[PDB]
């Protein structure tokens, strides 16, 4: 029963202030203290540090010692993870985890996103790739996403009907903006006999697109 | 702080097999030190605590070993659930710190890429954009170099690339390089290769088109 729900993701500007809760439930909250774990996007995990549930007292790392701070509302149940002055490299998921004994980090939260941009709120310009009209057993097709801000986005093939043979690359950042693609790969027989069609939507902007993919010429 | 170092970040074995994660310190810690387990969607979750002690809901077939300064994490029969990054953890003074990390991997028998490349959307091309797709799918080992051949010449810049994770239920690798420029720049030039340099082949494969 013991869980720590966190907030959901977050988009700030260079500069700005972001504040992230930890939620502490099925348990007594002033037994135990509530450490923060900072992961940048491909690193590792970083114990930031923790706090203690009684004193609220924190007790923070090296590097995350001026423009972060730990903080609770002992009625609420809930820890707080405030950043100001926020940069680039400030650009990661935060975790909350209870500190139990023997120093283990038990009970962790799902992490809370935070990011870092100057960029607006953009939809995707979403682009069907067909092949070339020049043969074989089997036929990759492929959809296009480009340049969408922020994440995430979601892309199924034929309402989710169609999962084998499918490749959906993880979004790279360009311009400040991120760019996503995704192959399906089918037999000869069934395209362009039967309609393939790429659903890609970005809730952010409130954007669903439905795109078939047709053949050149 | 002390430095808690992982001498390998990737690791690759055989379902079935035996497989050791170590963990250097660079002070003794006197056994404490845990281990910890992240899932490709991000989860974390403790494995071993107190070098030894496996937690509450482990398989029996984790164990850890160490002392001083020297640590290490084993898992015997290796199953296709237990691919993941495993990072291991000091507490014996503060602050604590993790170690790089080590990425899990399933060995299989070597793949040769399958490129395809695509040429712009009719669609990109009145929004004045241009991208030229090459995908390369379903290969291993997971080293691999492309290579933008533009009029016979290296294109160097503008090459955007995406990797993807092992794949869960082949466990192959696959890359998405698109080469992104404007319709003016992709009207400038006509003749768009795509090099694959890989393991499995002397000569790399190569697909290409033209806007003939």
């Known amino acids: 029963q013991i869980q720590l729900v966190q907030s959901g993701p977050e988009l700030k500007k260079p500069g700005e202030t972001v504040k992230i809760s930890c939620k502490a439930s099925?348990?007594?909250?002033?037994?135990?203290?509530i450490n923060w774990v900072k992961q940048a996007p491909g690193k590792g995990l970083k114990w930031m540090g923790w706090?203690?549930?009684?004193?609220?007292?924190?007790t923070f790392a090296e590097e995350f010692t001026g423009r972060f701070a730990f903080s609770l509302e002992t009625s609420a149940s809930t820890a707080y993870l405030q950043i100001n002055n926020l940069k680039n490299e400030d650009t990661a998921t935060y975790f909350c985890?209870?500190?139990?004994?023997?120093?283990?980090?038990?009970?962790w939260g799902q992490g809370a996103s935070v990011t870092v941009s100057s960029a607006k709120t953009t939809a995707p310009s979403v682009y069907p790739l067909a092949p070339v009209c020049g043969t074989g057993s089997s036929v990759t097709l492929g959809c296009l996403v480009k340049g969408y801000f922020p994440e995430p986005v979601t892309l199924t093939w034929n309402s989710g009907s169609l999962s084998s043979g499918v490749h959906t690359f993880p979004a790279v950042l360009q311009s400040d903006l991120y760019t996503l693609s995704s192959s399906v790969t089918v037999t000869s027989s069934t395209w362009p006999s039967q309609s393939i069609t790429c659903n890609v939507a970005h809730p952010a902007s409130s954007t669903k697109v439905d795109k078939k993919i047709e053949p050149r010429g | 702080d002390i430095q808690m170092t992982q001498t390998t970040s990737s690791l690759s074995a055989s379902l079935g097999d035996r497989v050791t994660i170590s963990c250097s310190a660079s002070?003794?810690?006197?056994?404490?030190l845990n281990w910890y387990q992240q899932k490709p969607d991000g989860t974390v979750k403790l494995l071993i605590f107190?070098?030894?002690t496996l937690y509450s809901g482990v398989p029996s077939r984790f164990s850890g070993s160490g002392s001083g300064t020297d640590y290490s994490l084993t898992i015997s029969n290796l199953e296709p659930e237990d691919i993941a990054t495993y990072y291991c953890?000091?507490?014996?003074?503060?602050?604590?710190?993790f170690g790089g990390g080590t990425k899990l991997e399933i060995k299989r028998a070597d793949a040769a890429p399958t490129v395809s490349i695509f040429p712009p959307s009719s669609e990109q091309l009145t929004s004045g954009g241009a991208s030229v797709v090459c995908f390369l799918n379903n290969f291993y080992p997971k080293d691999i170099n492309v290579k933008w051949k533009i009029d016979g010449s290296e294109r160097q810049n503008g090459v955007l690339n995406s990797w993807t994770d092992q794949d869960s239920k082949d466990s192959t690798y696959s890359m998405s390089s698109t080469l992104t420029l404007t319709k003016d720049e992709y009207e400038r030039h006509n003749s768009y290769t795509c090099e694959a340099t890989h393991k499995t082949s002397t000569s790399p494969i190569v697909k290409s088109f033209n806007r003939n």
């Open positions: 099925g348990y007594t909250f002033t037994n135990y203290g």
């Open positions: 953890q000091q507490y014996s003074r503060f602050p604590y710190v």
């Open positions: 985890a209870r500190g139990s004994e023997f120093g283990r980090l038990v009970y």
């Open positions: 706090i203690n549930t009684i004193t609220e007292e924190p």
């Open positions: 002070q003794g810690i006197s056994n404490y």
């Open positions: 107190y070098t030894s």
